[PDB]
Symmetry: C3
Subunit: 222 residues, 3 copies
């Protein structure tokens, strides 16, 4: 509690935990294989985030990087490495995407997160932003595929449309927060940055899942 | 050989190596695609464990963690990260599990191992057990799915029943050994802990594989 | 630019980048799901390599290992961990390989790279070569499967034959370069070793992809 941002890490942990438990209870008794995939994917997402928010709260998921002793929460990338592709899989399964398109998405996502991590830990200040730029190019490619790389059922199309729009908006904020926060230019304090990421993460995982798991799009059509 | 536990790391290495070679020879000439998956999965398991037991023997897979300079063999988690999901896949393929259920299993398993590793390396003593608890919750979820989340063929059902029972028993010992050994309360010396893990690992990988690969459950039914 | 090998890391970065962009443009408008998989796989390969060549150029992907202060470019293994299995998947998809065989290949490849990395970072000089030997055994197993573990269409068979022959030749050079270069016996300077790896990598990723993506083997047969 010596670090001002502890409050948002604590709240983040609690909200991911509760979301995980909610999705877990909700998924009880589901027999439809299609719906099972969506529950499995959607429940794992906040469960993973829970563990990484906890690691940050307890101080395990924090390291000091010298550029310009900067506190970098590296645990976010461990979280994102797994949760972002899973979120993309939810969208991909919804629309019955070709395997080729899933691979494209998952691979671009690995690059986005991997280069983001490299940027986060880079000791030469100017180079951090080179990695930011490549990571953003990978994000833009993902956004492109989501709008132009590909829903047959009307309920599938409408849910996909919503979750896709939710994704483009929230995901796009991440590079901006990084850029202006402690990993980037340092204009916004780590405390506020942590709050922004918490709001983003919770919306993109728990908000996302609520929207998805309450839709009948997740069941094969009697 | 300056570390008393070297003998069990040496034996572990030899037993995983021989098991790998046995499974490799045995799988020669197998043409049935189903049986091929089982051999591939079951042979990779001890092959991976071989490499990580070797890394521990030679001292690469050991680090010192300050809490309470504690010797932590981190290589176990590198091994388990890959071998535990593969073992779960063997069981899952056997019963023709839905993809949703496989994802649930694999994901819960990643969490179990990942939080186990975080626990192993955590520098605040009390917090190590928080991570132990979350990892155990993930294990219990796996055990639950194995008994209640789902075999049609009688030979499939019987083999599955055996391998499942083998799994519940041996896997459950792992958290207990951790808790009382050098990663946890330090009641049992690293030397004995290493022996216990060796016996467990060899039974859960080589014993498991022997049981599976001698069964006709692994072939599609003339 | 203080390190003589910077020139080859710079060229490597440029060539992977251009190859990525070429494959990206070329894959535009492709609707055939089969062809989509090949483009996705084949474009991701140099894209990944691009990022890791960049990391090496900027000095992030380099560490000092004490044996015999040896400069080890660890980023190569981060690259190879993902790009080698993807290259094997290209070959595997081409021939419609059984899932069992894909798993065998991917798993053996993970072992090859993982033990290679362990070897690269090992502090006891003699032991480095133990890891080299195990990694090579895994490579030889891959080479075996590629020739004896399994093409129906004549265009599929011919393209596969070429890409397979390209693979056996180039991949086999890697262990030799390691052995004689800075990770191994230190007979050939890091500068020359980096050049050799650059030529190899570019041929095995961009040369490979050119050959594959210009073939009609990648489309399902009007
Ligand atoms: C649950 C977490 C989510 C949905 C996280 C999404 C994160 C991103 C889309 C991050 C993107 C970034 C870049 C595009 C540039 C570099 C910094 C990153 C990693 C924040
Ligand atoms: C071949 C290796 C096997 C089957 C290993 C299984 C290991 C576990 C089930 C470990 C479980 C653990 C917990 C449940 C709590 C924390 C400590 C661990 C990682 C030993
Ligand atoms: C694009 C990169 C490619 C195709 C890299 C292939 C690399 C190898 C086949 C490396 C093999 C190695 C061994 C067999 C022994 C130890 C050293 C390695 C990792 C270079």
């Amino acid at each position: 509690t010596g670090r001002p941002e502890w409050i948002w890490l604590a709240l983040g942990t609690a909200l991911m935990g509760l979301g995980t438990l909610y999705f877990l209870v909700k998924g009880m008794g589901v027999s439809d294989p299609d719906a099972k995939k969506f529950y499995a994917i959607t429940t794992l997402v906040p469960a993973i985030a829970f563990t990484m928010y906890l690691s940050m709260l307890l101080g395990y998921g924090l390291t000091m990087v010298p550029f310009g002793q900067n506190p970098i929460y590296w645990a976010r990338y461990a979280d994102w490495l797994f949760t972002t592709p899973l979120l993309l899989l939810d969208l991909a399964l919804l629309v019955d995407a070709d395997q080729g398109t899933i691979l494209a998405l998952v691979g671009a996502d690995g690059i986005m997160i991997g280069t983001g991590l490299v940027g986060a830990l880079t000791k030469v200040y100017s180079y951090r932003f080179v990695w930011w730029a490549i990571s953003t190019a990978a994000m833009l490619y993902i956004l492109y595929v989501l709008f132009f790389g590909f829903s047959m059922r009307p309920e599938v199309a409408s849910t996909f449309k919503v979750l896709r729009n939710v994704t483009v908006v929230l995901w796009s904020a991440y590079p901006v927060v990084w850029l202006i926060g402690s990993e980037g230019a340092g204009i916004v304090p780590l405390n506020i940055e942590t709050l922004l990421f918490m709001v983003l993460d919770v919306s993109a995982k728990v908000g996302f899942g609520l929207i998805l798991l309450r839709s009948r799009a997740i069941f094969g059509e009697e």
